Every structure is written in structure tokens, then in C-alpha cells.
Write a protein that binds this ligand. Structure first.
Ligand SMILES: [Cl-]
Ligand SMILES: [Cl-]
Ligand code: NA
Ligand code: NA
Lengths: 135, 155, 134, 154
């Protein structure tokens, strides 16, 4: 699974996610990746999110939309919303993985509950950060 | 405040399993793709085109399980999925279970931009994309020896 | 599209939706019905929802889960949440249709923005209500 | 303890319908909601109740699900269903199936006998067939009225 989220100079948010799924999967099994609000979600009013992880739990938990709703309706900060989803609700369902999120204010979050997540981010006109292991 | 983030998947990435040279191949790919996105954003390209290109690059990068380097199914095939969403229009496009499209995220963006639909599946998604002039490929092009070795390891 | 939602005597919520989709649909186009949080959602902590409508808008709007989130996080009543989703947000996206929802307290809503929705509901051991039109 | 059901929303026309025509739908809706109320009153689970209500709506040829499914552009039937258990937050869904009489029962099988949540097409069918669910021809779903609506929509 791979993904990108971005906020542009016009204040637009967008998200994208792509995958080959789990090694040894049944053909015709559908994980979160192509499912709006599971693997991918963006709304100028809240957040752009791209998920990677235990597939089913991301669907059942609608992880990508839950970040947005926690922020939009619950008034959680991006950081609080990412902690709630990735560190509390996903583990509660036995879900492992993470996601990347940018909010309408340009805050960025790359939470994950696994040993690693291949990840990177950067402000336009700034130097990028990259990571693999837990920070 | 323009900004990009990318990922190449979360899991049991083992430090005792990896050489620095192996790690640097991932770091180099992540930095090149994030830098392309930053440069596009800075030049005033759209979030949608930015996440589309970043995910296309992650697909082409055989280190990451999407497009080239996709994991193998139980049947030693590749079936790929993708989604894209525009926060401005709340339009989305998605393809599930495609094997003959090189860049599933471009097929997802085709559904978003050139159909009134959000999600297409399997041969229907492929026939839709082919009818819009997207090239057909063999799923063999996605195959890497490393993902094959992980399949053999799992069974 | 058809659906059911229920609260049982143990306080459990469930939802189910089934469809043949839009007349003259492309085969391998996917409406909300099989998409968790679009056509169907249930959580003992909030609501059970089954949707029917312009499919794409229910997906883009994640209508079934939005009821639950508007209630759980937004503190909206079932009635407020159903009004917000079916009467404001779906039309705002050009989406037409409705849904049925029961919350963990046994409140029931059957909102729709269309000319009709074939619907019924009833409390266990009470008489059922049926409807077609507004 | 409470049930609600629907048989779909849209442009259902009053000036198009007789009371006798309307009463066919009212009778079907009341009979299914009554079955669910009686199950709930007897202490059946929300999951069994919504499963059986949707099975009956599938069987009811007046509603666009199972028997009485609309026709696709190709004069075929492709069916979808979903079920979710609010107690476990487990879900099962089948999308684009043509050889399963009751997609909701297939959806429940995916929920109960797999972690997959959503299965599509031949995969969903093979999953159900491998667990002894019977294969049907999509011709069993066909009704004159939905065929007339296909011809109308063109
Ligand atoms: Cl690191
Ligand atoms: Cl009425
Ligand atoms: Na790749
Ligand atoms: Na039916």
C-alpha cells in the first residue's frame, strides 16, 4: 500500500492510495484502499487522509473518514484525532497500520502503531523529512 | 502553508533484517517523490495532481506494494486497487481488482474525471479505462523476485 | 434497494441492505449498498443505518456512518443527524434518496428527500406503521 | 426493541398508482415488519432480524433486491448486499453477484466465516459455493415490470 495527501496554495486538500493488498490474498478480496472513508478521504473543510494497515479493521473503523469526523464534529485537533484512531480505536479492533493526514490549516500527521511505516513529508519551499522506524 | 505527505506502507519493518544500503534505497525513493511533490506544490500545481503523481511514482517504485512491486495473491497473480479524492468537489474515483492497468491511481483518477461514478471493479474497470485509451498491460510487469520470495516464505 | 435496521431486547443494533442497483447500470459499477458506512452501518454505541439513493453521493458523503458520527461526536439527536444528512448534505451534493436509522435508545427515523420511500417500522409487541409518500 | 425496513426511495408517483396497486406494497411491507417485530418480541438477535427482513424483501418481487432486481445496461442482474453487527462491529458485503438467490445471506456468510468484510463477483460467489450456498441463474430475478422499466429508461 502507498499513498499521498497534499494541501495546495489554493487551500485544496486531496488524497490518493494504491495497493496490491496482502501477500497470498484471495483473488476478489477488497481491502480498504479503494473504499472512500476506509483507505482514502479528503474534504477541504477538514482533512485529507491516506491509510495503510490491517485491511478489514480500516474498513470496519472507516479510519480515513473517522479522522475527518473526529475533527469536524468532535473538534479534536489533527494530533488528537490521529492518536484516537491509530493508537486506541484500531488496536481495540486488532488493527495494525497507520495513515498520513493533512488538515485545512496545513498541520501534518503520520501516525502508525506498527514497527515501521515508510513515510515522508515536507512544506513547499522547505526541506523534506523521511522515516522508516518509530521516531 | 502548502505541504505533502507520502507513505509506502506500514508493517513489521525489521531493523535487524535490513542493511543500511537496503534502508537507503527506501529513503532515496521517499525523498525523491516527496521532493517532486514539494516542487509541484511550490510551482502552484493542484493537490489532486500532486497526490496523483506522488502515488504514480510510488506505484512505479518496485520497493512499494502498489503497481510495480505489487504482492502476489494465493494464485501467484497481481490484483491492484486505488482511490483518489478531491477535497474541493468531494468527487472520488476508485478501481478494485484490476490486473491489466499499469497505474491503478491513474485509472482511479479516470473514474473520477471521465465518469459520473465513484467506484468500478475488475474487467469492467479495465474495459472502461481501455475505452478511454488507457494502455493494456500484462500483470507479469508487476512481478519482482522479492515479493515472490515473500509469497514462498508465507506458505 | 431494500434494508432493515433493528434494536433487540439485549440492546444490540444491526443493519442490512440489499439491491440490484440502478436500472440500466453499467455492470461492475458499485453503488453504496456493499460499502460499509455508505449503504449500511451499525454500532451499539450509536446507530444502525440502511440507506437507499443516488449511489455515488451516498459513497462520497459516507451517509450511513455520517449519521453515527454526527450523533457520537457532534452530539446531534438521531432526528437532527437524519435532517442534516438527508435534507441538507445529500441535496447539497445533488444526491436523492433516504435511509432508515435506529439508535441505541430505540429512537427511529425514516428520512428521505425523494417523492417516496417504501418503508415500515414497529416497536416489538406494538402495531406497525407503513408508508410510501411524504 | 424496534425494527424499521425500506424497499427503496425515488420518484414513486401517486397520479400513476391505484390504491389497490399501493396496497400490494403496503401489505408486503407490513407482513415483513410484522415478522421482524414477532422475532424481536421472541428475543431473536438484531442481526437475525435484519437478515430475515432483508431476505424477505429480496424474495418480494415488488422490491429491487433479489427477485425483482432491476436490469443492467446488458439486460442482466448484478446484486449487492451488506450486513453489520453493531455488537462486534463485524460486517460482510458482496458486490456484483449474479448467481446467489439471497445476497444478504452471502453477505452474512462473509461476515461470519471470513475476516474479508467485502468480496466481489466470482470471488464472492466461489466463497459462498465453497461453503455450500446454492448456485442460481440470474433469470430467476427477472420480472416483466423491471424489464418494462429498462425499456422505459433507454
Ligand atoms: Cl527512521
Ligand atoms: Cl404514505
Ligand atoms: Na510499486
Ligand atoms: Na425483491
Amino acid at each position: 500500500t502507498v499513498g499521498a495527501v497534499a494541501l495546495d496554495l489554493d487551500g485544496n486538500l486531496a488524497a490518493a492510495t494504491s495497493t496490491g493488498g496482502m501477500t497470498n490474498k484471495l483473488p476478489y478480496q477488497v481491502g480498504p484502499t479503494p473504499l472512500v472513508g476506509a483507505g482514502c478521504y479528503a474534504n477541504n473543510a477538514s482533512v485529507a487522509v491516506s491509510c495503510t494497515g490491517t485491511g478489514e479493521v480500516f474498513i470496519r473503523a472507516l479510519a480515513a473518514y473517522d479522522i475527518a469526523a473526529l475533527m469536524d464534529y468532535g473538534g479534536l485537533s489533527l494530533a488528537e484525532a490521529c492518536e484516537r484512531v491509530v493508537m486506541e480505536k484500531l488496536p481495540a479492533l486488532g488493527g495494525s497500520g497507520g495513515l498520513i493526514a493533512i488538515d485545512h490549516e496545513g498541520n501534518v500527521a503520520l501516525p502508525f502503531n506498527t514497527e515501521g511505516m515508510y513515510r515522508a513529508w515536507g512544506y513547499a519551499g522547505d526541506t523534506p523529512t523521511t522515516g522508516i522506524y518509530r521516531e | 502553508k502548502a505541504v505533502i505527505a507520502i507513505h509506502g506502507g506500514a508493517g513489521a519493518i525489521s531493523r535487524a533484517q535490513m542493511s543500511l544500503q537496503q534502508e537507503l534505497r527506501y529513503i532515496e525513493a521517499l525523498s525523491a517523490i516527496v521532493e517532486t511533490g514539494q516542487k509541484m506544490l511550490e510551482a502552484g500545481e493542484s493537490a489532486l495532481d500532486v497526490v496523483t503523481e506522488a502515488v504514480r511514482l510510488l506505484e512505479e517504485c518496485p520497493l512499494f506494494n502498489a503497481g510495480i512491486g505489487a504482492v502476489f495473491t494465493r494464485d501467484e497473480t497481481h490484483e491492484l486497487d486505488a482511490c483518489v479524492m478531491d477535497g474541493n468537489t468531494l468527487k472520488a474515483g476508485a478501481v478494485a481488482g484490476v490486473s491489466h492497468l499499469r497505474n491503478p491511481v491513474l485509472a482511479a483518477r479516470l473514474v473520477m474525471e471521465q465518469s459520473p461514478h465513484v467506484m468500478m471493479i475488475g474487467e469492467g474497470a479495465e474495459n472502461f479505462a481501455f475505452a478511454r485509451g488507457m494502455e493494456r498491460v500484462s500483470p507479469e510487469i508487476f512481478s519482482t523476485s522479492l515479493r515472490y520470495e515473500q509469497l514462498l516464505a508465507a506458505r
